[PDB]
Amino acid sequence: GAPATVTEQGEDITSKKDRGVLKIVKRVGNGEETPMIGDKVYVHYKGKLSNGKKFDSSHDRNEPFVFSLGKGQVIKAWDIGVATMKKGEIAHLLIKPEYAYGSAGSLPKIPSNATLFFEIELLDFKGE
Numbered sequence: 001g002a003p004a005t006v007t008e009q010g011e012d013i014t015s016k017k018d019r020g021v022l023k024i025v026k027r028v029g030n031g032e033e034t035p036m037i038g039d040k041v042y043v044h045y046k047g048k049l050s051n052g053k054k055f056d057s058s059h060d061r062n063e064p065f066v067f068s069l070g071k072g073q074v075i076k077a078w079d080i081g082v083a084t085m086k087k088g089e090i091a092h093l094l095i096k097p098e099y100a101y102g103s104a105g106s107l108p109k110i111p112s113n114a115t116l117f118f119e120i121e122l123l124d125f126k127g128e
């Protein structure tokens, strides 16, 4: 399914080239502009453990998920990944534990050493 496709075909968008954050563009966005650190960003997303034991959606409250980019308000893989996206874009990310919740995890919700998968739609981004 979606996670395996990203494993075998996804682009490694880490600085370190450690395959910690892999990305496939599923729908192309508008213009050339991607968000800057500190930009207010607006998304819709679905996410899951790659196990599939826990699943999560902004769609399951009909209201976009909003955060300031590059401030570590979200896991590192999102600050990396959403920074590569254009307004209108839909992307898939597959994320190793080092760029998500690590060896500590986030119990009881996220186990130790969990791999995560997200589908993300970048709706909009606005300056600080």
Ligand SMILES: COc1cc([C@@H](C(=O)N2CCCC[C@H]2C(=O)OCc2cnn(C)c2)C2CCCCC2)cc(OC)c1OC
Residues within 6 Å of the ligand: 045, 047, 048, 049, 054, 055, 056, 065, 067, 073, 074, 075, 078, 106, 109, 110, 116
């Ligand atoms: C551990 O707590 C939670 C985790 C999650 C889900 C998750 O991992 N994310 C949610 C969207 C942004 C990326 C990432 C994250 O940075 O989340 C921490 C967080 C949430 N709100 N803010 C501002 C930052 C998980 C959920 C299980 C399936 C895999 C993704 C969502 C949470 O609540 C909606 C959450 O509780 C706070």
